């Protein structure tokens, strides 16, 4: 182990008043999918999820548009994979209040965000339990589901009684 022929190479570097271009600082990062991640694929700095699409592109295109003229599909240059673009922030927030001199606790409603915690058809509702019976509702929410304060006593959500 001390007299065998070893191949020894030396990689020296040059430093002068010349542009540095043989070096490549750009590094191809990991591909992440189904998460709200910012990307810059050659034409835009867009933030959104990258789902697995089922539509193929013709072998000369790089981008993808829709009926509303929005970039929602970009081919991945790493492996020629077609990925969709969908924004993450949807709608605002809403708060259910039983009223003055009735209760103190409130329930928070998300408009178009997908998730004690009940996944209603009108977004995410947190802070109000779901009960299968149906009464006449007073506080409208949407998609046929209301909220109310009944029996201690807490805020409940149910399908409205017609």
């Amino acid at each position, epitope marked *: *182990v001390g007299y065998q022929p070893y191949r020894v190479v030396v990689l020296s570097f040059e430093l002068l008043h010349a542009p540095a271009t043989v070096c490549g600082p750009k*590094k191809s*990062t*990991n591909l*992440v999918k189904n998460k709200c991640v910012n990307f810059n694929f050659n034409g835009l700095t867009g933030t959104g999820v990258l789902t697995e699409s089922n539509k193929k592109f013709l072998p000369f295109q790089q981008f993808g548009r829709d009926i509303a003229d929005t970039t929602d599909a970009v081919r991945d240059p790493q492996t020629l994979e077609i990925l969709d673009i969908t924004p993450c922030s949807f709608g605002g927030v809403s708060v259910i209040t039983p009223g003055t001199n009735t209760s103190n606790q409130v329930a928070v409603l998300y408009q178009d965000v997908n998730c004690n915690v009940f996944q209603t058809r009108a977004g995410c509702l947190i802070g109000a339990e779901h009960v299968n019976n149906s009464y006449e509702c007073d506080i409208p929410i949407g998609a046929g589901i209301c909220a109310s304060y009944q029996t201690s006593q807490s805020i409940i959500a149910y399908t409205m009684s017609l």
Partner: antibody
Amino acid sequence: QVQLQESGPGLVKPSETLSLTCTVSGGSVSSGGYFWSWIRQPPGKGLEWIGCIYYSGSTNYNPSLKSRVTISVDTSKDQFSLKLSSVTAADTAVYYCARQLWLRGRFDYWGQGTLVTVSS
Amino acid sequence: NFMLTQPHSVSESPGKTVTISCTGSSGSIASNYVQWYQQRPGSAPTTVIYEDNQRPSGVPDRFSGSIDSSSNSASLTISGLKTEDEADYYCQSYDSSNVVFGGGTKLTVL
């Protein structure tokens, strides 16, 4: 930043199978082109290197611990686990999950060591 | 069959400059990079030097390392010993796809 946390039971019977998983938060397993390594340290003795893994199937093992280590990487759960076979009474060591910046370099970040004891 | 030889017990009063060695048996000590780890009792080890002469950001400048390749020994020089310095010191190697650690040196005080 990024941290490493271990899990799994602190006990294993002799001549059994060990299952300890090290989870990662604040980073990605397959991103950055880094390595993962398991290092053990018995109480009162020096550190012992078990093996190192890549986010692909590349593995290299200690010849004293060869044919007994089984380490796998699951990118979906952002964690990697080590499996040990034929554990004996001399395997009492504090197991450290340390990220390895450079293969022949140093483990820049070390996870907290779980205590593993064996008894019959 | 490459193992790092490290002094088991090194003891010194605070304030003097002490040297911790790490000798390789078969392979030369300049063949691969050697990393020193200072580990507190009941705590995870922490890297205190890298590339045999470079101190990572956070450790004091007194963690100076030197390489004596003729004797195949890696040296770590500690100057200005303090109370918190009482910890286990291990030297790392790589050999050939097989990371080998050192014997261990507790920094005992006088």
